[PDB]
C-alpha cells in the first residue's frame, strides 16, 4: 500500500550546490529503480550520479544551482542478431538395411544463414559427459556408422547460429531417440 | 542495477516471435507489482501480456522468493541492425530560501555571502563572529560548536564538528 | 520479380511531391524496403526506411524536419513525402528492398528535379 | 554518423588482371557490410553480400573478404563487361551510410 519514499527532504548548501535526499523500503526498491527529477521554473531534468546506503534505504544527491526561485522537485524512475536462441529440431531415425539419423528445422526466411548443428549418440549404460559429439556446418541428415549388434543406443541433437555477424543461445535439446538392433 | 533488468534476457528465432522471461521478487509483489514495458518509438509505448512459469533458465539470483515469468511478442519483420502497478509519485515547492543549510564551520579557533569532557551534553552550556566563569580548571571541556543562520535573516543548522 | 517506382518530377522549391512505389509478383510476407538517393553524376546518399507497422522512422541530416516515410503492408505500397525541398536533393529517387544486412531487390528510380 | 570510406578512388586496369579495393569503417562492424556494382543509368547491381559472400547471378572471379573495420574487395581475373562504379554498404547500425564511391577503367 504505501512502498512510496518518504521524507523528501533537501538544503542548499549557500553557493552553487542544492542537496536533496529521500528513503525507501529496501525491498520495493529493488525492484524499481528511481531518479530526482528537478524543475528550475513552473524544463525538467535528473541529477547524477545518486548515492545509495536496514530495513529502508537512503538516497541522495546534490544538484548544481547556478541561481529560480519556486522549485518544482520529484521523485519519478537488444540486439535481435546476437541474441537468437532456435527452436528445438524435429528428430527420427531411419536404417537403410546401416543407420542413417535425420532431423528437420524451422524454416528461415533468410534461407542462407547456415545452421551449426551438434549432435550426439549414447550407449545407454553411460554418461552424455562422456558421449560422442560430433559436429556439422549445415545439414539435415547424418549417416552413422556399425555399432554393437544387440545394445540399445540413444541420440541427441541441437542447432545453433554460430555464424559471425549473429550471436545467441544454443537451442533446447530434442526429445532423445532410441534404437537397438 | 534492479532485478527485473537484471534477470531479464530476450532470445529470439528470428522469424515469427521473441521470447522474453524475468523475474519479480515475491517481497516487492505484497508492496507493488510490476509489468514489463517494450517501446515503439519516442512518443508512444505499448503494453504486453505476460504470464507466469516454473523455471528459470537463462537468468540467475540469490534472493529467497522469485516470481517468474514467460512473455511471448510477435513479429513479421526481422533484420540486424534491429535493437529494442497503479501511480505513484509525492511533489513539493521548495523555494531555496527557505530550504538553506549552511557549511559546517571549519579551521576559539574558529550573490554572497560547551561542556565538561566527563558531564554529558545532555545540558550543557550555551553559547556573533567566528571568534574560569565558564569552566573549572584541571578539567577539560570538547568543543562543539556549529555554524546555524541568524534568525532575523531560513533553514536548518550545520552539521556539527 | 522486380518492383518499380512512380511520382515525382520539376517543381519550384519549397513546393512538396508525393512518391509512390510497388511491390510485384514476390513470396512477400513480409520483407522491408527502404528509399535511397542518387545525386546527379554524383556518389549515393541514403535517406529513410519505415518498418512493418510504421513503426520506426530514420531519417538523416537535412531530412529531419522535412520528409516523412509511411508504411502501407496493405496492397504493398511503400510511399514517400517531402514537404520543403531545395536543390541539395535535385536528384533521383532509387527504392530498393533491405533483405537482412544488404538490400537485394532494387527499381528503375525517378528523377526529383526541384528548380523554379 | 557512420564514416564509410572506400580506396582507391579510381584505378584503370587492363583485362584478364588481378584488382583491389577497401573499404574503411570509422566504427567497428564485426562483418556487416556489402559490396555494390554499378553502371551508369542502370540501378545498382549487388556484387558481393556479408562481406566475404557472392550473391546468385555474380561469378567467382570476384572475392569478397575481411572483418571489424578492414575489409576489401578482390577481383582475381578481369574482363570487360566489368567497367562500373563500386560501391560500399554499411550494415552493422544506423544511420546506414555507403561508400564515396570508386570507378574503375580498362587499360584498352
Known amino acids: 500500500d504505501e512502498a512510496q519514499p518518504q521524507n523528501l527532504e533537501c538544503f542548499f548548501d549557500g553557493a552553487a550546490v542544492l542537496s536533496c535526499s529521500w528513503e525507501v523500503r529496501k525491498e520495493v526498491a529493488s525492484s524499481v529503480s528511481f531518479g530526482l527529477f528537478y524543475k528550475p521554473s513552473p524544463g525538467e531534468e535528473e541529477c547524477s550520479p545518486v548515492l545509495r546506503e536496514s530495513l529502508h534505504t537512503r538516497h541522495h544527491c546534490q544538484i548544481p544551482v547556478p541561481d529560480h526561485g519556486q522549485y518544482i522537485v520529484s521523485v519519478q524512475p537488444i540486439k535481435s542478431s546476437v541474441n537468437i536462441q532456435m527452436a528445438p529440431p524435429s528428430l527420427q531415425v531411419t536404417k537403410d538395411g546401416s543407420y542413417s539419423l535425420r532431423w528437420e528445422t524451422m524454416k528461415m526466411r533468410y534461407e542462407h544463414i547456415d545452421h551449426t548443428f551438434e549432435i550426439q549418440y549414447r550407449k545407454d549404460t553411460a554418461t552424455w559427459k562422456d558421449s560422442k559429439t560430433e559436429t556439422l556446418q549445415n545439414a539435415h541428415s547424418m549417416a552413422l556408422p556399425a555399432l554393437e549388434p544387440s545394445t540399445r543406443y540413444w541420440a541427441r541433437v541441437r542447432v545453433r547460429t554460430s555464424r559471425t555477424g549473429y550471436n545467441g543461445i544454443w537451442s533446447e535439446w530434442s526429445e532423445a531417440r532410441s534404437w537397438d538392433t | 542495477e534492479t532485478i527485473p533488468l537484471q534477470t531479464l534476457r530476450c532470445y529470439n528465432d528470428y522469424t515469427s516471435h521473441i521470447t522474453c522471461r524475468w523475474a519479480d521478487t515475491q517481497d516487492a509483489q505484497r508492496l507493488v507489482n510490476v509489468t514489463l514495458i517494450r517501446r515503439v518509438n519516442e512518443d508512444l509505448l505499448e503494453p504486453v501480456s505476460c504470464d507466469l512459469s516454473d523455471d528459470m533458465p537463462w537468468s540467475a539470483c540469490p534472493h529467497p522468493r522469485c516470481v517468474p515469468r514467460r512473455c511471448v511478442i510477435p513479429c513479421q519483420s526481422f533484420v540486424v541492425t534491429d535493437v529494442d502497478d497503479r501511480p505513484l509519485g509525492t511533489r513539493l515547492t521548495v523555494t531555496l530560501t527557505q530550504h538553506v543549510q549552511p557549511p559546517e564551520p571549519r579551521d576559539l579557533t574558529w550573490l554572497s555571502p560547551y561542556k565538561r569532557l566527563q558531564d554529558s551534553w545532555e545540558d550543557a552550556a550555551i553559547l556573533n563572529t567566528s571568534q574560569p566563569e565558564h569552566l573549572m580548571p584541571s578539567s577539560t571541556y570538547v568543543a562543539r560548536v556549529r555554524t546555524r543562520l541568524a534568525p532575523g535573516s531560513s533553514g536548518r543548522p550545520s552539521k556539527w564538528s | 520479380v522486380q518492383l518499380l517506382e512512380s511520382g515525382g518530377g520539376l517543381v519550384q522549391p519549397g513546393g512538396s511531391l508525393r512518391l509512390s512505389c510497388a511491390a510485384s509478383?514476390?513470396?512477400?510476407?513480409?520483407?522491408?524496403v527502404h528509399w535511397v538517393r542518387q545525386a546527379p553524376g554524383k556518389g549515393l546518399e541514403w535517406v529513410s526506411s519505415?518498418?512493418?507497422?510504421?513503426?520506426?522512422?530514420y531519417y538523416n541530416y537535412k531530412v529531419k524536419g522535412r520528409f516523412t516515410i509511411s508504411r502501407d503492408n496493405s496492397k504493398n505500397t511503400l510511399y514517400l513525402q517531402m514537404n520543403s525541398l531545395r536543390a541539395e536533393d535535385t536528384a533521383v529517387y532509387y527504392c530498393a528492398r533491405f533483405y537482412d544486412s544488404f538490400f537485394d531487390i532494387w527499381g528503375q528510380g525517378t528523377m526529383v528535379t526541384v528548380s523554379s | 554518423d557512420i564514416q564509410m570510406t572506400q580506396s582507391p578512388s579510381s584505378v584503370s586496369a587492363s583485362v584478364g588482371d588481378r584488382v583491389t579495393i577497401t573499404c574503411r569503417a570509422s566504427q567497428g562492424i564485426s562483418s556487416w557490410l556489402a559490396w555494390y556494382q554499378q553502371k551508369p543509368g542502370k540501378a545498382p547491381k549487388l556484387l558481393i553480400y556479408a562481406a566475404s559472400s557472392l550473391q546468385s547471378g555474380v561469378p567467382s572471379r570476384f572475392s569478397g573478404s575481411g572483418s571489424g573495420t578492414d575489409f576489401t574487395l578482390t577481383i582475381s581475373s578481369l574482363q570487360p563487361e566489368d567497367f562500373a562504379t563500386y560501391y560500399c554498404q554499411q550494415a552493422n547500425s544506423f544511420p546506414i551510410t555507403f561508400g564515396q564511391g570508386t570507378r574503375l577503367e580498362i587499360k584498352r
Open positions: 519505415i518498418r512493418s507497422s510504421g513503426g520506426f522512422p
Open positions: 509478383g514476390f513470396t512477400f510476407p513480409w520483407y522491408r
